[PDB]
From a paper:
HAdV-D15, D24 and D32 were crystallised in only their apo states, whereas HAdV-D25, D29, D30 and D53 crystals were also soaked with sialic acid. To evaluate the potential for these recombinant [name] knob proteins to bind cellular sialic acid residues, crystals of the [name]-knob proteins were also soaked with sialic acid prior to data collection. This resulted in four structures of HAdV-D25, D29, D30 and D53 in complex with sialic acid also shown in Fig. 1. The conformation of the bound sialic acid was found to be a mixture of the α and β anomers, freely exchangeable in solution and minimal protein side chain adjustment was required to accommodate either conformation. Soaking in sialic acid containing solutions reduced resolution slightly. Y314 and K349 (according to HAdV-D26 sequence) are conserved across all sequences, while the remaining residues are similar, suggesting the existence of a common sialic acid binding pocket across all species [name] knob proteins. However, the four sialic acid soaked novel crystal structures, provide a much more reliable view of the binding pocket and interactions with sialic acid.
Each protein forms key interactions to promote cell infection, with the terminal domain of the [name], the [name] knob protein, interacting with the viruses’ primary cell entry receptor. The adenovirus [name] knob protein is known to have a highly conserved trimeric structure. Sialic acid (SA) usage has been proposed as a cell infection mechanism for EKC causing HAdV-D. Here we highlight an important role for SA engagement by many HAdV-D. We provide apo state crystal structures of 7 previously undetermined HAdV-D [name]-knob proteins, and structures of HAdV-D25, D29, D30 and D53 [name]-knob proteins in complex with SA. Our findings demonstrate a conserved binding site for sialic acid, common across the species D adenoviruses, therefore suggesting that, along with CAR, the receptor can be used to initiate cell entry.
Residue numbers in the entry:
A (entry chain C): 186 to 275, 285 to 371
B (entry chain B): 186 to 371
C (entry chain A): 186 to 274, 281 to 371
The structure:
Amino acid sequence: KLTLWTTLDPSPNCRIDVDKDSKLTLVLTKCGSQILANVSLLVVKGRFQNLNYKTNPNLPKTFTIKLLFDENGILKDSSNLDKNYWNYRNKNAVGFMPNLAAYPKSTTTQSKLYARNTIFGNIYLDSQAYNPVVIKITFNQEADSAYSITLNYSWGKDYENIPFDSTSFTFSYIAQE
Amino acid sequence: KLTLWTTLDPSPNCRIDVDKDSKLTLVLTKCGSQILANVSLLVVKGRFQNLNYKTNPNLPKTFTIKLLFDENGILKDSSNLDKNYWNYRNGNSILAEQYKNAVGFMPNLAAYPKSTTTQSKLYARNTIFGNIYLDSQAYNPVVIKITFNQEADSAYSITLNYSWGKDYENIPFDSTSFTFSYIAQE
Amino acid sequence: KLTLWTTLDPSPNCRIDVDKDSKLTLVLTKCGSQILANVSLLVVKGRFQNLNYKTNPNLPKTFTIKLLFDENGILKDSSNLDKNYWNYRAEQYKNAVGFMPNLAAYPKSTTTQSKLYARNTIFGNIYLDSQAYNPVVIKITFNQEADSAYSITLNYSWGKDYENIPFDSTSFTFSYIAQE
Ligand SMILES: CC(=O)N[C@H]1[C@H]([C@H](O)[C@H](O)CO)O[C@](O)(C(=O)O)C[C@@H]1O
Ligand SMILES: CC(=O)N[C@H]1[C@H]([C@H](O)[C@H](O)CO)O[C@](O)(C(=O)O)C[C@@H]1O
Ligand SMILES: CC(=O)N[C@H]1[C@H]([C@H](O)[C@H](O)CO)O[C@](O)(C(=O)O)C[C@@H]1O
């Protein structure tokens, strides 16, 4: 009842460009009014599996994984994460949603959120300190969802045959209730 | 699982230089012997609202927000944070009765000793460093230095020191969120 | 919300090169299926107490502290941390599998390969002597050690030619997925 997560099942569970090109491990543990979050990401196939900017000049240095939730905190099909790999550990989940007062949605006109809607972290590819990636977590940015967690990954380095196999990052956010 | 926080009320609640020039969002959630802390800061007016080191050569690149607590973990008036915006959680605002004991939320004095007469130099473990960012951009870093029990005329203290190196040009001091934990007094 | 930790007792409790050359402060607090961890490290004697790369050219810029656990989550004598300074918040405990890093989330290296998944690892920036300009990289790796059911490996490394800087680290918070 306490923890909402992606099962630890080894099989791919996430779409960046293409169905099942990635495995997201996301654990949301409710500790009162804060959610303790833990995230890692492995790309298993497609253009981001093996980064080589020396050989592929058209390769982006960013992708975005979105978790979209309805008014009851149910994950929506339009999410990048496959609905079938998201459940409580061994139903309503508003206690796990990012607080709308703390993290307001952008009025249609604006598009500009407060800064507090966002968390930045440094994560690393292939367990090496010298393969940094910036993870940008943004709450309630997506307009056609009551709640959202957006995971933006970006990097600067001209990586040469580095697998997108990320280290683990911990963060917290204020819970809706 | 009791939580001690600044209400989420949009109104300013904090003094850097001047009454109500800033809005601190601080949430302290007690998970047993550790406090899970979450902090963001917006400057709403004054010299730090909009940073421009090209146009204002006299502008510091640091300020300090202090939360000072008495022996009972009550926030003191001398704190930078307005006492009226600080209480236990009961929605998206605070409980009615202003609180009586919060020692369970205070930074442990054994883990984070106050500086003995002999030395004003604390142990390093009294301090947490984090990188936060202005205006949701990775290229506007600010160093947040959180220090416990550094202030001498208080039983307990949380000191939030903000500093940066870049000659920012028209960047609003509107910070991203940072999570940390510390060992609780009880 | 049971907590497993090193007592806050001021006495040294850890071996980097030599018995009691360091004091590790590690607090593992169980919040359901995640462990909330808090760590600081002070070196009290030996070659790493005071870093000077101008005066000592043979000094490494890394050391590793290992916590090794058996199938019941009991800390083993072969650990760098002294067994006597590790208990619930002194008659040693009996089961702590609820505090161990999950074997499904953080698999041990198959015989074939010593190469773990990246998710077994957490990187953090910590600082010596409470100064932003004395960075140290802490690399936390789970279940890397082959002769233990469970392990937490704390690798410390740095680049700067520090001149008379004490290895007195700031505090770092992380979490990991619990075995149960
Ligand atoms: C974990 C970490 O901070 N590693 C950093 C490494 C260093 O190898 C290390 O910090 C030295 O101790 O430098 C970078 O690659 C760099 O210069 O672009 C950034 C990267 O984030
Ligand atoms: C999250 C993070 O580490 N951000 C860092 C960024 C980005 O990494 C870089 O803009 C992408 O290439 O670099 C800095 O702006 C810089 O170089 O001065 C410092 C800042 O702390
Ligand atoms: C990010 C942080 O907290 N500390 C960083 C400091 C300070 O930002 C700087 O000394 C104050 O201006 O800069 C470095 O030493 C650097 O540029 O090589 C890296 C170090 O990680």
